């Protein structure tokens, strides 16, 4: 596990998106993962794997209300670094029914960071996003659909990141 993932799981969300300055909203509402956006800053991005594998409902209490109830889910928790400096922690939960067809690849991603560049085959949409916060830090959670199949993606922005 990891202190940053512990922090990510403590974020508290608002049903309504706050009226933040537009520079900060550009970042939080971005329709993609942070990969290319961070590279844009003049950085090399790398992933540290914290935890990966199949888990049962009891391991995903925060996400369960937002996804289909199934026997198993694929869990992916990472730390994203920019030139060696941690900038983000992320937690992705995929119901196993979403793992079919091209989407089965979500399972073999490893240390490659997630991004729209990887799913050119599938159709991508987001039906919900909320902004959260904890102890001065910003986070967000989104339900994305690949070819109609859902997954939940949560991101915590570390203070080293450009949002601050
Ligand atoms: C938030 O992460 C993403 C968002 C969206 C989106 O919101 O449409 C698409 C792909 C992503 O990897
Ligand atoms: C680089 O940005 C992201 C990567 C991942 C990942 O690889 O699981 C998740 C959320 C992100 O914003």
For residue 129, the CA-to-ligand 1 centroid distance in Å is: 10
* Experimental approach: X-ray
For residue 99, the CA-to-ligand 1 centroid distance in Å is: 17
Q: Ligand 2: which residue has its CA nearest to atom 8?
A: 114
If one counts every other C-beta atom within 10 angstroms of the C-beta of residue 151, the result is 22
* Spatial CB neighbours of 32, under 8 Å, sequence gap ≥ 6: 115, 116
CATH code for the domain defined by 1-164: 3.40.1410.10
Which residue reads 């991005």 in tokens? 45
Q: Using CB atoms within 10 A of its CB, is residue 154 exposed (0-12), middle (13-18) or buried (19+)?
A: buried
Q: How many Å apart are CA 133 and CA 135, to the nearest integer?
A: 7
By C-alpha distance, which of 159, 160, 152, 161 is closest to 9?
152
Q: How many residues does the chain have?
A: 164
Helix (H, G, I), strand (E, B) or coil at 103: helix
**What kind and span of H or E run contains 6?**
helix 3-8
**Phi and psi torsions of 90, nearest 5°:** -140, 145
Beta bridge partners of 95: 73
Q: Is 42 left (phi over 0), alpha (psi -120 to 50) or beta?
A: left
Q: Ligand 2: which residue has its CA nearest to atom 5?
A: 114
Q: What is the resolution of this structure in A?
A: 1.9
Query: Could you tell me the two tokens for 115?
Result: 């991004």
């Amino acid at each position: 596990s990891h202190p940053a993932l512990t922090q990510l799981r403590a974020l508290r969300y608002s049903k309504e998106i706050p009226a933040l300055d537009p520079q900060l909203l550009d970042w939080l509402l971005l329709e993609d993962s942070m990969t290319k956006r961070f590279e844009q800053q003049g950085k090399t991005v790398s992933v540290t794997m914290i935890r990966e594998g199949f888990v049962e409902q009891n391991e995903i209490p925060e996400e369960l209300p937002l996804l289909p109830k199934e026997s198993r889910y694929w869990l992916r928790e990472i730390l994203l670094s920019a030139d060696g400096e941690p900038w983000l922690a992320a937690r992705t939960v995929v119901p196993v029914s979403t793992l079919s067809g091209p989407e089965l690849a979500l399972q073999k991603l490893g240390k490659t960071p997630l991004g729209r560049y990887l799913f050119t085959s599938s159709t991508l949409t987001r039906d919900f996003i909320e902004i959260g916060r904890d102890a001065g830090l910003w986070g967000r959670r989104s339900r994305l659909r690949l070819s109609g199949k859902p997954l939940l993606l949560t991101e915590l922005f570390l203070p080293a990141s450009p949002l601050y």
